[model samples]
Target chain A: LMKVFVTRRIPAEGRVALARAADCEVEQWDSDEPIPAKELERGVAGAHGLLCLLSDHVDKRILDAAGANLKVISTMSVGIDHLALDEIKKRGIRVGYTPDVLTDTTAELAVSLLLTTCRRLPEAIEEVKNGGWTSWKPLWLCGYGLTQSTVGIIGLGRIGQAIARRLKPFGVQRFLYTGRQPRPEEAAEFQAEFVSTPELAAQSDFIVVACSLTPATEGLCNKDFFQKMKETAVFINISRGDVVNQDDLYQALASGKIAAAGLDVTSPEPLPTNHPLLTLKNCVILPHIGSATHRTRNTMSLLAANNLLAGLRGEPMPSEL
Target chain B: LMKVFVTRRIPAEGRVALARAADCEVEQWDSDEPIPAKELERGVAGAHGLLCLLSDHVDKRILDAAGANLKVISTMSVGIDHLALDEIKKRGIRVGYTPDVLTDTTAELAVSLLLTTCRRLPEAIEEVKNGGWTSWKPLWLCGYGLTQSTVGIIGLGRIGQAIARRLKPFGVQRFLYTGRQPRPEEAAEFQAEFVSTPELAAQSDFIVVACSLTPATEGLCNKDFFQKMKETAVFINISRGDVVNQDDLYQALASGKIAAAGLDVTSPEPLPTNHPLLTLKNCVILPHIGSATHRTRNTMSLLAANNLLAGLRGEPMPSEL
Candidate 1:
């Protein structure tokens, strides 16, 4: 029997699938917490397959510890930033990731986060609890609305297009997108305009970042980008944390350079309780839960299990990367 | 010159409009707080026109105090629940309300509240702040997604249709609505099926009460209504608080009979700070901010001002009822 190591406990469907797989033995960390580095190395020391999460750092050290017997790595997440892709490629290991299944789920979260930030939900809830909800006072708790507004998306890929589709019916007048190149085919659906990053930043009433984390996209939303944006504009990030310069974002919100921001993914993930961003009322931070839905997580886990089993059998993996 | 009493301070646009009106003298409460009952009666005494908020109870006592000189009563809200409409009509007082202008804003807020409740945003944010967001666990912070879910709206009125339009692209599989009668013209856009209240409650994954509060609709979502709902269903109310039974909703959420609920409007407005509903993590209560957006409130104020001025001039009030 071939051994497969799961970095952490996942949903029941994936575990059930692994258990039912022929000639396969699965070992999981069996904890809600992330496995320690040393334990992870020990868990995969002689495994033939590995099922990991976005929190696990599957780098050269982990790869070396897993030995030549490790034939596959399947991640129950869309992001591959935690994986050492180049090193894994050199070792001839197959990789699979959950992507399209999470597009709608994450897009929904982006819209939810955007609305929560712009409408000031958390603040309003706090007011109700703290006896600040005095009475129905006009102009109280007022925020910006999405009607007849321009929206700019950093990446008009799968998730970006889904976000646009969901936001279009909210009376958005215009859609602007910027990346390495314009996607005319996808833009046609929402009548999205191809624009330079500076133009998009300056013109948009709301900006959302849904791009992948690549070398070029690292720190994409810096002070210069924020400076170009309208002071009334709202910013949302459902992408990786490194896509934004945390200091610049904090300064922008604190100094009133921008209106507000909602972040699902942040630098160093869990973002130290004392992070400066947490102190600002304009910055709404959530624990990175882009794909955190019972149905979506279960589906992703099953897909990851299938991919792992297929890779071990030397068959084509469902979503090979 | 004719005098107009504004119950509370409003947006600058409305104030400016009232200021610019010919032969009009505006006297406002000039405070963020709701006007005192005695003060409200005194302010409107002998005034030709009265501008009020939803919080001001324009009852028979106030109407009698106004001495019949109040020819027009323009409310800067869509709901006239606070107004003694029957008494005003008997006194031949013309009424105008700001409606259509606030439809989009209210609908946007409904969607925001629904998403916030179903996704457990406030709880998730709290977790992030309290060091509970340790790492990315597959099932952590998992909440329902809109994808392939059945949504039941209580009324397919203007705001309901607007909410439907905005939610259709979120991969909602079915749309069901209940009202006094079937609205073919409105329902055609979303292919929304007309169903009885019981059926809607039993079948839907999400339920939104966007209906007007009336004798027939009062206490519509009571214990029986919640009992018929699926255990995993999420209930949302953007309408008047009396439209639902608070006790039933509290029990439903606290007992997990229903997954959760989001309330934008509550009985007695700012529900007492120590209300039992506040103790549940599954219930997200927001200060009634349905029409609280800078642009929307400003526009509603302008409309109210226009309505008041038009009524004083003996012309048909723009949106008189």
Candidate 2:
């Protein structure tokens, strides 16, 4: 018999799949919130497999706590930054993650954030709620439009390509991108041009950050990058938070260096209520819910469970790292 | 010299155009708020042309007060419901309105409203503000997506066609619509299927009302129409308010007969602070600002001024009705 520890409650399908597996015993936190560190240490003491969320930071201490019985790790997210991959590989443990299924969902959210920020939807709603909507002032709540505008994308990967596919019909005139290398085949449909990041910032009307977080890419959108952008340009980020310097973004917006910004990822998830970014009317923030669709989440959960069971039985995981 | 009565203060472009014209004297309200009824009557009493907005109801009484000197009326909006057309035509008064210029801007707003409601953005923002966003819950705040869903448009006119053009790349599977007749030329790209109103209500997962207000369309989306729709359907209205029965919509939303609604227009503009619709969490209301982009609004103002000038000179108006 194998024992599995789930760090937090997930979709019902994942729980059912693990519970119904033959010769398996399951222990779960069974709460919507993240389990406390001490409680997590106790829960995984002798488990053979572990399931967790992006909020869980798995490090050497956690590995030592799980003991020698832990053979497999599965997480219900696409980003593996939370797990210490070097440590996991040292112990000869297999890792599984859900990818590709979230491309469309996250891309859709990136598009949503773009429209919300550029069109000033949240600020307009606040005006209506606070009785500031006296009458239709011709200049009141006016915003930027996507028609005939250039859209610059950083790292035209799967999610980046998907975002372009959805925005093409909105009459975007041009698409420019920067990545490790050019992807002619992937970008042929959009006629997207490959350009340097600085050139993209200077010439484009809207800039989207969709690149991975790495040493070279960290703080890529700092003061220098923001200074190159047009005064009317709008910025959006669905990638990891550390890629952007929040202080620089704040200064850019305050001094009118950039028109506006929309964020789904921040330096600290669930940024404190008193954070300066929250006070800006031009910035729109969502609580890191890029894949929070019913269909997408359920699929991720079920795939995660299958990967865990396959790894425990000495079978190849569906999506192994 | 011909005298023109300007009902309320508008964008600078319109005033500049009018002021720069020869042989014209302008008497203006010069305020953002609507002119008082007595003041409006006094301003129009001897004017040769009238420059107005949707908020000014140009009825028979106002026309009578203006006397035989009022030869033309130009409105800064597409909707002519506020003007008594029968009386104007009987008096040989020419009418000009800004129409085609607003199609893209209005269509863009319709798409914005749809995404904002389906994603529950306003509700999610409130949670973040009140500190309810504790951790990433798998199923928390999950909302609908546009992929693989049917979109039904009511009244596939210029604005409706513009909307379909923008939404085509978002992965909408089928487009169903109802209008006076099929517009094969406009619907070709979307391959929209023309269907009856009730059938559209039943088959669509998202319904957008983009038709004009007339005796035929008044109360078209009442209790019977709401009853025919799928319980999970989302409703969006960027058209005139009277086209929908507000009381029936209130009942439908309060009872959860439909998932949610987004309104860029309502029965009474600047909806009363304590209205019943304001009490619902699922309904999102915006002040009427479909054509409120800075570029679009400025262009519309200049166009309206030109229409007034040409009509005053006994020349044909640019967009005469």
Candidate 3:
């Protein structure tokens, strides 16, 4: 009989997908919480397929514990940095991830966070609750407007393009993007101009980092990037946390180098309460919930299950990278 | 000398505009706080022009105090409810209001408040501050996404149309609007459908009230309206507070008649500290700040000043209603 191990409890539909497969015995962690490392190791001891999340770090130790029967690993996230890609490739295991299904949802989150920071939602909400919301006076809680402003995107990929598309109608006057090569076809639709990273930083009123965390891209938004940005500019990060240097970001925000920042991902997410960045009024943080929508999550779970099932059956995954 | 009574301290540009005018002696309530009623009446006495804000009640008594010398009543706001237009008209005082200049900023705030409510921004931010951000769990702080959702606008005027345009690119599947008459010219661009108010309440995932507060629209969104809404729909109000029945809104949110509400305007400008709506976790109340961008306010103030100066010189006001 085929054995499958799910590292966490996903939507019921995702579990049903595995149970429907012939000759398969599916076991789940059964809790919304991340499975403990020891329990995860034990659960995958003789598993034939492994379905996990970005939270479950599939490392060398987990691979060693799973033994030789592990033929598939599917994650319900787009980012693959969490998975030990080298180890998975060495073992010739098929890898699958849910990507396109989450693009719109994640892009929607990025847009939400962008507005959240620019308009100072968190601080304003705090004021409302704490009795600081006095009479409405001009310049009180006034924020930067997106109208007649330029938005610079670090990567004009699927999610990046989607963000631009969403912001265009909010009266965003210009769209600037930085990539190795210009995506003329896609950029043409947004009337986006391709510029160098530094140039993009200097010109944009809102600089969004949406690029993948590759070696070349990692730590790309450091002190130099922040320094070149407009003092009134807002920075938003919905990509991997490694893409930005948190210290530089914190410094920029602390010293008023930039106006504000909204981050959905952080270097050490579940960012500690004592973290200096957490204390700043100008910084808004979310626990990387880019795709935390009921519809999106259920669809992502089903996609992950389908990918796992296909891999176990020695078939092509609907989305494999 | 031509004396002008400035209701509240406006931006420096506006004051400079008035000060630069020949024979103009400008007296202002030069503070962020609203001027006392007694002080307001005293300030307007024998004035040639009255430059005010939405907070100032320019009724018959105040108009009488300003006397026949008050030829102009220029307000730094779009809404005329605060100004007794009938009395002003009876006295043949030319009126000017800042309108088109605030459309983009106010629409942007509506969009911002919509995202804030739909995405559960205030709750999520509060969680982070309170250390409830323990882990990145699926379904934890999950929210409704704009993708594939229907948006309903109560009034598809300049602001409502702008909102639909802004939300269109965020993967909004359809637009529904209700008004006395259908705005086909503006709706054509967004492919927005004209629907009855009840139909809009029933169909929309997001309901935005952007209509003027008049006899027809007063308390438009009431208990009956809330009863017809979907349980998951989010209600947003950027219009005058009188347009919505706040008690009904509170009940709807409290009883889960609707998912949530984000209000930028309430029955009273500053909703009391312990208002029932403030107690609800799902209700996000903002101080009336729809047109509170620094740039937008500066422009509005300048426009109001221009209107006052023009009216004082017996020239047509820039934005006469």
- How many backbone overlaps does candidate 3 show? 0
Which candidate would rank higher by TM-score, 2 or 3? 3
DockQ of 1: 0.88
Q: What is the interface RMSD of candidate 3, in Å?
A: 1.2
Root-mean-square deviation of Cα positions for candidate 2 versus the true structure, in angstroms? 1.6
lDDT of 2 by residue, B1-321 (tens): 799988887889998999988789888888888777788898997799999988788999789989999899998888888898999999999998899988988988898899888888788777877898877778888888888889999998888988888777777999998877888888888999999997998998899999988899899989898888888899999998998999999999999778999999888888877889889989989888788777888888888898999989899888887
Please give each candidate's TM-score: 0.99, 0.97, 0.98
- Candidate 1 vs candidate 2: the DockQ winner is 1
Candidate 1 lDDT tens digits, B161-213: 99999999999999999988999889898988899998999888999999688
Native-to-model Cα distance after best TM-score fit, residue B94 in candidate 2, in Å: 1.7
Question: How big is the positional error of residue A12 in model 1, measured in Å on the Cα after superposition?
Answer: 0.3
Per-residue CA lDDT of model 3 for A1-321, tens digit only, reads 788899887877888878898767888888887777899998899898999987898998889999899999999888788889899999998898998888988888888899878888777777777888767677688889898899999889988988898988888899999987789898888998888888998999998888688878788889998999999999999988887787898888999889999998888767888878888999988888888888989988999999998988888889887
TM-score (chain B only), all candidates = 0.98, 0.98, 0.98
Tens-digit lDDT string for candidate 2 (A1-321): 888999988898988999989868988997888777788888889999999888888887789999899999999988888888899999998998898888888888888888888888898887788888877667688888887889999989999999998888777999999998999888999988999887999878888888577768888889999999999999999888888888899988988999999988888777789888888888888888888788889989999999999989999888977
Model 1: residues >4 Å from true position, as ranges? none
Ranking by lDDT: 1, 3, 2
Judging by DockQ against the true structure, name the best candidate. Answer: 1
What tens digits encode model 1's per-residue C-alpha lDDT throughout A192-305? Answer: 998999898999999999998998999999999999999999999999999999999999999887899999999988799999999998899989888878999999999999
| Model 2 fnat value | 0.56
Model 2, residue B42: displacement in angstroms? 2.1
- CA shift of B141, model 2, Å: 0.6
